[PDB]
Symmetry: C2
Subunit: 342 residues, 2 copies
């Protein structure tokens, strides 16, 4: 059963082509709608098609964002088209085989940890996509393992699901209730309406800790649980620190819990540089958190820049250094540290 | 197993502590709070649940203060409490109930069956009694979920536990928005409201009903955003007024504009219309518009429970559902007319 749509290419001139595909299987189902997988006939290439209803009201924000995104660490919008009494928008994405979520559980359920080089490789690439999408002022707002697509042959990581993503204007308020449990920044948990893009790097640091721990660092199915678990690690926040998250949440009842030594929250085998980076990401005051670019240039990732670093399967490391002017606009002097001799 | 012998203070009653001793102590659960153990009391042989928590140096424990004031057949019983040994830890010795709505519901879902409407009626009713009872003190549970609903499956008695999140709600005093758990958060909580009423409990209870009737959660999602798209996909987009009644400052955001789904088509085709209707009256955007728990008890959907003939499938009789104190009824005393059926007055 072959299906032939008239799809608009994702980038470049708004010029539709006939696109055929077969072997439709279902890969996922979420609040948005369903995510199918199909094989393109004119290539054999496997794509993930994602159907989502389109309100007649305004244009689709995800499409508008995905249509402007061009980066080797963001899932590529191959095409998009419209299908059948109301109208769904179908985003044709490049299919990637695995995910950080699936990969970690595997290791988790085998009781052995994901090897650090994969943490370096996946985390570096994550912060790269962030440094990218941030530079447009675009906050993802749902960074979680299930959104970090993973090609195990190439070690390529790709960020996806821009359903919740948004360009943050300062003074223009946004909903508190974005981001998934375990990964919400404290300012979100406190319902702050004026968070910055640093909620994404908070979340990212939660992913790092998890890949190191083999379980989420801040679990709980309530905001209260999560907050308690944060405090058992970062310590009871201060008045000055509650302020920089969400005012009027000062002078509430909080567990007078003393800060825990970061090195004693991880396996003893764990790298000091890894603990140190993790430190500078999971920070109460949202401005004191590393910017994604800054993170990329962290000592934790220095292995990645060795001339003779190769992937465990023999292959060469993926394209880690092709930074562009814009990707480095946060802090252009960091290029001296992020782009090595080769 | 060793025997631990402690001099614990009993929950209800004057502060007259007893030597209590127990063996077989074994982990029943772990969470943010601390550990929850099961032990066997040497005196009775009775099975108990011990809940260990670090005691804050600054103040008397809130949970204990709330538990020591509660006494109802549908709220878990604080048998004893005591302090243990670094810092100091409170132990809440609770009576052990063998099941939870969480686990029973999963069995059915796992077997691809649904919980029989009679049990849905029985359990939902008992949940609303405890809610009506604790609300009566001003106490709001703020964490109603299937895991906090213990069951004895033989006697079909349901008990509400985990008062870890519970607060007495004074109007004009703010409360943290981030209580309540994934799937059961009322919309004004999703919206980060600091001024909510105990109607959040009625919203959670509405979810549980829907879940038992659906065989799965009705507003799933790991994010507030996902959860709200699910709530809307049923209720429809909330009006400006409806947003301002959950939380002003959200009145001018860009919400999905989906037209409201008919409730009859949001459930299984055999599902009784009385249940479909209790839901719609609990799952309302406007917080002030939801049934009082006591109004819920007194609702068409539980009229079977008020039948003198009603028997449990095992042949045992129903648990005591009509022994209403004035404290419980204080919300709305004339609803006794409905609540206490004729044969419960024969004496
Ligand atoms: O759910 C979602 N899934 C997406 C996706 C994109 C490309 N490849 C995959 N592949 C997989 O799921 C691998 C596990 C097989 C998924 S995007 C997306 C969203 N919500 O936007
Ligand atoms: O978690 C919690 N679990 C509690 C509890 C109390 C009495 N009986 C049981 N029994 C069971 O769990 C049976 C299903 C095995 C649990 S209290 C509690 C809290 N958070 O306070």
């Amino acid at each position: 059963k072959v299906t032939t749509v008239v799809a608009t290419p994702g980038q470049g001139p708004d010029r539709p082509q006939e696109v055929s595909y077969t072997d439709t299987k279902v890969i996922g189902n979420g609040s948005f709608g369903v995510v199918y997988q199909a094989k393109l006939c004119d290539s054999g290439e496997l794509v993930a098609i994602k159907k989502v209803l389109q309100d007649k009201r305004f244009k689709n924000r995800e499409l508008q964002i995905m249509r402007k995104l061009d980066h080797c660490n963001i899932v590529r919008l191959r095409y998009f088209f419209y299908s059948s009494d109301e109208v769904y928008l179908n985003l044709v994405l490049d299919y990637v085989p695995e995910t950080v979520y699936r990969v970690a559980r595997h290791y988790s359920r085998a009781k052995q940890t994901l090897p650090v080089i994969y943490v370096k490789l996946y985390m570096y690439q994550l912060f790269r996509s962030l440094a990218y999408i941030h530079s447009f002022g675009i906050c993802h707002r749902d960074i979680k393992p299930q959104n970090l697509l993973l090609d195990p042959d190439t070690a390529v990581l790709k960020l996806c699901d821009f359903g919740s993503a948004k360009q943050l204007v300062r003074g223009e308020p946004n909903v508190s209730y974005i981001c998934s449990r375990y990964y919400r920044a404290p300012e979100l948990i406190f319902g702050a309406t004026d968070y910055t893009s640093s909620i994404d790097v908070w979340s990212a640091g939660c992913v790092l800790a998890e890949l190191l721990l083999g379980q989420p660092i801040f679990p709980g199915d309530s905001g209260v649980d999560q907050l308690v678990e944060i405090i058992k690690v970062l310590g009871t926040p201060t008045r000055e620190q509650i302020r920089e998250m969400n005012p009027n949440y000062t002078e509430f009842k909080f567990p007078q819990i003393k800060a825990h030594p970061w090195t004693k929250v991880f396996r003893p085998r764990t790298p000091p540089e890894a603990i140190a980076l993790c430190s500078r990401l999971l920070e109460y005051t949202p401005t004191a958190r590393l910017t994604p670019l800054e993170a990329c240039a962290h000592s934790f990732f220095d292995e990645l820049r060795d001339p003779n670093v190769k992937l465990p399967n023999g292959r060469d490391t993926p394209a880690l250094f092709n930074f562009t002017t814009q990707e480095l606009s946060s802090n252009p002097p960091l290029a001296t540290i992020l782009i090595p001799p080769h």
